[PDB]
Structure formats: structure tokens, C-alpha cells
């Protein structure tokens, strides 16, 4: 049984969403043991909450980030980071909000 460092698969470099609408971004990964997923923006962890507009759903090889009723303040560079006992990986997507 071999450990596998985390590896993020393809992630869009830039995405757009109109203000007020819902945005979903899904990204696959590999890693053994299953990596811990962290989404961040402005160097700060995004916390998934039942109430609130930000939701994160993580499985063994997928993360989905949902931002509901998107606001101008949500725009910016988002980082997806993965960690496990054998390494780390990160990628970014730049989210553009249209008025």
C-alpha cells in the first residue's frame, strides 16, 4: 500500500457569475490518505455553513464550492489547497462578478 501525495486535477483559471446568482465550482483530486480540503480567499479559510451563502461539499476525490446570491464582495482569487501525510498541493481560480 503506497501513500499518494495530494494532486489537484484541472481547475478553471477564471470564472464569471452575474451578481445575485448561484455559482458552483467542482474540482477533483487524488491522494492517499484522503486529503484535507481547504478553500481560501484573501489568505483566509472559507468556512462552510448550513446558514450562509458559502457551502463546501467534500468527498474522497471531489470538492464542490457553492456561493449563493453572489455579491460584488465575493470576487477575487480563490485558492484550493490539499494536505495529507505525504504532501500538499494548491491551485487558484479567479472569480469575476458581473454587476
Amino acid at each position: 500500500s503506497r501513500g499518494i501525495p495530494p494532486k489537484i486535477e484541472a481547475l478553471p483559471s477564471d470564472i464569471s457569475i452575474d451578481e445575485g446568482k448561484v455559482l458552483t465550482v467542482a474540482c477533483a483530486f487524488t491522494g492517499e490518505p484522503t486529503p484535507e480540503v481547504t478553500w481560501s480567499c484573501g489568505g483566509r479559510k472559507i468556512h462552510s455553513q448550513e446558514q450562509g451563502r458559502f457551502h463546501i461539499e467534500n468527498t474522497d476525490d471531489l470538492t464542490t464550492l457553492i456561493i449563493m446570491d453572489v455579491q460584488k464582495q465575493d470576487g477575487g482569487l480563490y485558492t484550493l489547497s490539499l494536505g495529507n501525510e505525504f504532501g500538499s498541493d494548491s491551485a487558484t481560480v479567479n472569480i469575476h462578478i458581473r454587476s
Binding site: 484541472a10 478553471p12 483559471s13 446568482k21 458552483t24 465550482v25
Partner: protein, 99 residues
């Protein structure tokens, strides 16, 4: 009554030999049924003799009839309706014969 796009199945990476077919697939839900487009290198892809977009209800694909080395790279699947957008990406690798 709107509800934003979501993926049931996301495009997966594919590794093919130069000249062979390459296919990406997604299955998307939402109300109304989302419109799916595909992007590469910052630009929306258009249908031609070498690139088609087979679809069957919620299932939407991308089919390269004969993949060339210049077809390699990251493809982004963008699903859209009045309520929102969903994005998922996948990398196509194309292997050239030696020597």
C-alpha cells in the same frame, strides 16, 4: 421556480494517442435545463468536423474525432441557466509516437 445548475457527473481527464478519438462527458441538472458550453484557452469552443458536442437530455459531451497534439490541455465545462452557473474542468493529454 428556478434552480441553479449542478453536476451529477463531471468531465474526467483523458490520455489518448495522437489520431485517436477523445471524449469528455458531463451530466448536469437544473431548472430550466442548463445550457452547456466548453472553453479552452480562455475561449468558447465551436462545433466543426473535428469537434462535436453530443447531448442527450442532462448528458452533454465533447468529442474530438481525431485528437492532435494541439488539442491537449485543460477544457472547462460551463453550465448556465437563469439561476446560476456551474463549472468543472478536465485535462486532455495527447501522446505522440516516438522518433
Amino acid at each position: 421556480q428556478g434552480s441553479p445548475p449542478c453536476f451529477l457527473r463531471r468531465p474526467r481527464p483523458v490520455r489518448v494517442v495522437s489520431g485517436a478519438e477523445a471524449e469528455l462527458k458531463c451530466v448536469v441538472l437544473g431548472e430550466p435545463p442548463p445550457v452547456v458550453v466548453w472553453e479552452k484557452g480562455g475561449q468558447q469552443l465551436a462545433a466543426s468536423e473535428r469537434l462535436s458536442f453530443p447531448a442527450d437530455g442532462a448528458e452533454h459531451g465533447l468529442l474530438l474525432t481525431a485528437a492532435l497534439p494541439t488539442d491537449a490541455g485543460v477544457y472547462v465545462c460551463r453550465a448556465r441557466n437563469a439561476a446560476g452557473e456551474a463549472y468543472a474542468a478536465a485535462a486532455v493529454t495527447v501522446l505522440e509516437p516516438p522518433a
